[PDB]
Design an enzyme around this catalytic site. Sequence first.
Site, mmCIF file in Angstrom:
data_model
loop_
_atom_site.group_PDB
_atom_site.id
_atom_site.type_symbol
_atom_site.label_atom_id
_atom_site.label_comp_id
_atom_site.label_asym_id
_atom_site.label_seq_id
_atom_site.Cartn_x
_atom_site.Cartn_y
_atom_site.Cartn_z
ATOM 1 N N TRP A 53 -7.213 3.845 -3.679
ATOM 2 C CA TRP A 53 -8.124 4.019 -2.544
ATOM 3 C C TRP A 53 -8.713 5.432 -2.576
ATOM 4 O O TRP A 53 -7.947 6.405 -2.619
ATOM 5 C CB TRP A 53 -7.367 3.812 -1.214
ATOM 6 N N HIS A 82 0.863 -1.182 0.000
ATOM 7 C CA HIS A 82 0.000 0.000 0.000
ATOM 8 C C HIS A 82 0.895 1.227 0.000
ATOM 9 O O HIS A 82 1.737 1.374 0.884
ATOM 10 C CB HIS A 82 -0.922 0.032 1.217
HETATM 11 NA NA NA Z 1 -5.317 2.026 4.036
#
Ligand code: NA
Length: 300
Positions: free
Chosen positions: A251, A192
């Site tokens: 995201w 991430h």
């Molecule tokens: Na996250």
Amino acid sequence: GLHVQGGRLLEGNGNDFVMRGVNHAHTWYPGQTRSLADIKALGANTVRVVLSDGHRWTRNGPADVAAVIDRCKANRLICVLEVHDTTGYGEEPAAGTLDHAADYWISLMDVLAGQEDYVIVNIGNEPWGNTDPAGWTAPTIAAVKKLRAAGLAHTLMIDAPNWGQDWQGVMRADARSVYEADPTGNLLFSIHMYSVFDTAAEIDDYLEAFVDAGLPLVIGEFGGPPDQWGDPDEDTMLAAAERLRLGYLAWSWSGNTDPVLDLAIGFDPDRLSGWGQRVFHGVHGIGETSREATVFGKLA
Ligand code: NA
Ligand code: NA
């Protein structure tokens, strides 16, 4: 089914599949059903769906998960399911364990069955915080072995410690051992990339470390707008992911407590934020680079 070979994610037919998609916060937004269709319409080929195992949030039961899988298929999307409750373990008090998540996945086996062409199981989101990230490896390996021993055949996806950003390099260092824990070899790592990844070299060096080792890697979440810790270099993430042909999932679709990361405002696909425009319409973005999974066949 979806599987790994030569460091690539392949469909059952052997065709190379590169994720170009977004995260959708299903577990907190059960009323936003149209999100998947909207995400597909903007070009995505994959969605990462936020589930809960019930440890911290409200458990998504088998019927609901079966419906999510069916909805992904109806929209010609590959589906990455993930248990969010593990987030930040050791630092977030409310966090659950990877073993708890594993028991949840095992409970879903009846609805996961026959969906190996479409569904990837991401064991737990960001399943360790910043405290003692070396502690992440043993329970990660144990969860992988447990799911395989239970008979789960789906390609797995593994998140890193340090809240998924792996800034102490534990997943990067221990990846080979984690990979080897899966007898089937059908396992993906996921990084991430947020404010830790604020320079081009940080991003290129990380991605290349996996590629050069022959290990499969996706960017399972990434951000763009700055936060108090720095400014993620999303331009380099997207360019590097295209150069190395690695999957990415932005995201997120909509509904963040802090709306800075909402790609779409108020779940309205016509109203993309600057961030949504960058991801969907910009250079190396989803509109430009996303190819539908071939399992679905040619449309019309
Ligand atoms: Na996250
Ligand atoms: Na940025």
